[PDB]
Amino acid sequence: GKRLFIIKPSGFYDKRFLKLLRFYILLTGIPVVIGITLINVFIGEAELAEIPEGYVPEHWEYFKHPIS
Amino acid sequence: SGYTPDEKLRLQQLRELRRRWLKDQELSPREPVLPPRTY
Class of residue B18 by CB neighbours under 10 A (exposed 0-12, middle 13-18, buried 19+): exposed
C-alpha B27/C-alpha A1 separation (Å) is 9
Q: What is the DSSP letter of B8?
A: H
Among B18, B25, B31, most A C-beta atoms within 10 A, so best to mutate, is B25
List residues of B whose CB lies inside 8 A of any A CB: 25-28
Chain B nearest CA to A51, separation (Å): 59
Which one-letter amino acid corresponds to residue B11? L
H/E stretch holding A12 = helix A12-27
C-alpha B23/C-alpha B27 separation (Å) is 8
Kindly provide the resolution of this structure in angstroms, with one decimal: 3.9
Contact A49, A30 (CB under 8 A): no
* Nearest residue on chain A to B30, alpha-carbon basis: A3
Q: Which residues of A touch B25 (CB under 8 A)?
A: 4-5
Contact A56, A36 (CB under 8 A): no
| Nearest residue to B35 via CA among A5, A9, A11 | A11
